[PDB]
Design a protein around this ligand. Structure first.
Ligand SMILES: [Mg+2]
Lengths: 70, 18, 39, 402, 68
């Protein structure tokens, strides 16, 4: 009876309310990470040194699973 | 028997010091 | 936590759906909770 | 209504014990310069500084020098340690803002639940330190759609009567409390240690007092009190021989009042000895419990461990109980048991074997465990139960086809 | 292939020993279990309480620090 209306309402509620909020929060997280690496490059530009040599994105999400300090 | 008298042998010889 | 005494808001949602046409029934069980820590 | 007397006999005979001592303030012991650990040196320092305080008060410039030098190191270490507190507070106010640090939630294992449904309730701000420690206490069967933890256990530990870090009376306390609108659980334990002498001022002579209480409403409607006084000395038969004696009193107070109810009185001894190549540690106990209405019931218990130089890997222990129920002339009920363990390494694996003998029912229990962190060569014995299951499958599949 | 055949072939001979049911009765006749490890516990509820065994207590070291 109403149960498919409940399923459609749950799918619509997810796809119109929950997905963009999590996407927005994640995008703020990568912009904060890019700010971190810009500051590190600026610090090594203040001396006469080289660039900090960040790792690639695969290493970024893998270390996001396997940190030791924060 | 065994753990009444010898349970006071240790008590008496601990009292013999202090 | 602003020196203890947390501030903000929290929302939780949970959906349970029965997929068996097996001894259990077809059911849909939904729960939503919303908490706001306001100054 | 009192517990069985085998509970008291097991509780009063559990091996060679050792009491609680003095803990030292590390910056004033070994004044300024870094130290190391040794029991006799710390025990010497604690009684030495009380002695030098008494002599310095009486006059005596040589004692006044030592006590003033200790006071100088004490002030310097205290100011350094509060400076470290200020530095840590400033570093925390820099690293986070006005925000606080948050603990890990407790892991309860797997469930048929989304496992972060209630994990936000056990992530809280720290508070860092107040003196006591708390742990939550959990039951075996929790509610179906909730977290299983119900009670709180508090733990406190101190050394009250010290002068400047030269302590007096080690003390600790533990209380478990579960309170809801139906029941009430309240258990508690306290220990107090009193040191009479340490070498070279004497031999090591320490007594210990333990108290404990049990309340469980509305199941029992009586409370349980226990008190233990037990004394240890290193010596009495030779140099460095760890002997000890003790007594225990217990009551089931009716209505909570400790003046009425059945009582239990017990005494215990411990010793170690070294003869030939055999080192043995033995303890023994006798309990004289009162029944609900029957009167005297008495029991004897003993434990022994026989350490052996040669073959330094064989462990062997022996245990004994004797029961004396009423009609004592023909109801002596004995019981004794033996336990052996050994340990090998072979095939890239670590083997451990344990043989147990109960000697009333003449049964030998053997249990071997192995651990191969290198390969799966240890799985060749896995063909033993896999055959019989097939022999219990076809024989089922025959009988299910008839 | 040879190993998983020979191991099962030896298991058929070694598992087919005579009787094979009196030892089931001998093992299950001792319905009292193997004796389990002793811990100090409370009388009413059986929660563990702390022990003072010398071979464990001789490794312990504490200290004193000022409070904040
Ligand atoms: Mg409890």
């Amino acid at each position: 009876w109403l149960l498919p209306v409940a399923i459609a309402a749950e799918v619509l509620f997810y796809r119109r309310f929950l997905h963009p909020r999590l996407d927005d929060n994640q995008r703020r997280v990568e912009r904060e990470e890019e700010r971190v690496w810009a500051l590190r490059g600026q610090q090594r530009r203040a001396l006469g040194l080289h660039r900090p040599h960040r790792p690639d994105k695969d290493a970024a999400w893998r270390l996001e699973q396997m940190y030791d300090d924060d | 028997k065994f753990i009444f008298w010898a349970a006071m042998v240790y008590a008496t010889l601990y009292g013999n010091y202090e | 936590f602003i020196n203890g005494n947390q501030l903000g808001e929290r929302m939780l949602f949970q959906v349970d759906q029965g997929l068996n046409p097996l001894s259990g029934g077809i059911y849909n069980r939904a729960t939503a909770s919303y908490t706001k820590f306001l100054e | 209504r009192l517990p069985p007397m085998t509970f008291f006999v097991e509780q009063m005979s559990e091996g060679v014990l050792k009491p609680e001592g003095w803990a030292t303030m590390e910056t004033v012991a070994g004044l300024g310069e870094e130290v190391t650990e040794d029991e006799g040196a710390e025990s010497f320092n604690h009684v030495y500084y009380r002695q030098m305080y008494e002599l310095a008060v009486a006059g005596d410039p040589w004692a006044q020098r030592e006590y003033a030098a200790m006071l100088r190191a004490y002030d310097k270490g205290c100011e350094s340690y509060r400076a470290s507190y200020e530095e840590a507070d400033v570093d925390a106010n820099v690293e986070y803002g006005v925000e606080s640090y948050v603990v890990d939630p407790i892991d309860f294992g797997p469930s048929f639940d989304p496992e972060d449904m209630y994990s936000h309730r056990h992530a809280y701000a720290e508070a860092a330190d107040a003196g006591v420690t708390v742990i939550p206490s959990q039951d075996y069967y929790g509610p179906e759609h909730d977290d299983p933890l119900n009670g709180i256990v508090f733990q406190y530990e101190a050394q009250p009567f010290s002068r400047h870090g030269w302590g007096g009376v080690p003390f600790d306390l533990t209380v478990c409390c579960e309170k809801d609108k139906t029941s009430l659980c309240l258990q508690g334990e306290t220990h107090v240690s009193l040191v009479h002498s340490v070498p070279p001022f004497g031999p090591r002579h320490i007594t210990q007092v333990t108290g404990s209480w049990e309340v469980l409403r509305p199941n029992i409607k009586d409370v349980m009190y226990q008190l233990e006084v037990d004394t240890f000395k290193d010596g009495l038969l030779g140099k460095s021989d760890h002997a000890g004696c003790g007594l225990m009193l217990a009551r089931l107070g009716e209505g909570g009042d400790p003046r009425k109810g059945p009582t239990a009185v017990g005494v215990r001894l411990q010793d170690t000895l070294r003869v030939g190549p055999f080192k043995l540690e033995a303890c023994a106990s006798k309990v004289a419990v009162q029944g609900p209405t029957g009167g005297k019931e008495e029991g004897w218990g003993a434990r022994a461990f026989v350490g052996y130089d040669w073959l330094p890997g064989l462990g062997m222990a022996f245990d004994f109980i004797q029961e004396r129920t009423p009609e004592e002339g023909g109801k002596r009920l004995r019981g004794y048991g033996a336990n052996f363990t050994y340990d090998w390494e072979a095939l890239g694996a670590a083997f451990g074997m344990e043989v147990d003998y109960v000697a009333a029912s003449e049964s030998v229990f053997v249990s071997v465990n192995a651990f191969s962190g290198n390969d799966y060569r240890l799985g060749w014995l896995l063909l033993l139960p896999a055959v019989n299951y097939f022999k219990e499958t076809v024989s089922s599949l025959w009988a299910r086809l008839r | 292939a040879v190993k998983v055949a020979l191991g099962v072939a030896f298991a058929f001979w070694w598992t087919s020993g005579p009787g094979a049911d009196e030892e089931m009765d001998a093992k299950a006749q001792q319905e009292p279990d193997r004796r389990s490890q002793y811990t100090r516990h409370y009388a009413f509820k059986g929660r563990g309480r702390k022990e003072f065994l010398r071979s464990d207590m001789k490794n312990d070291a504490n200290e004193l620090v000022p409070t904040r």
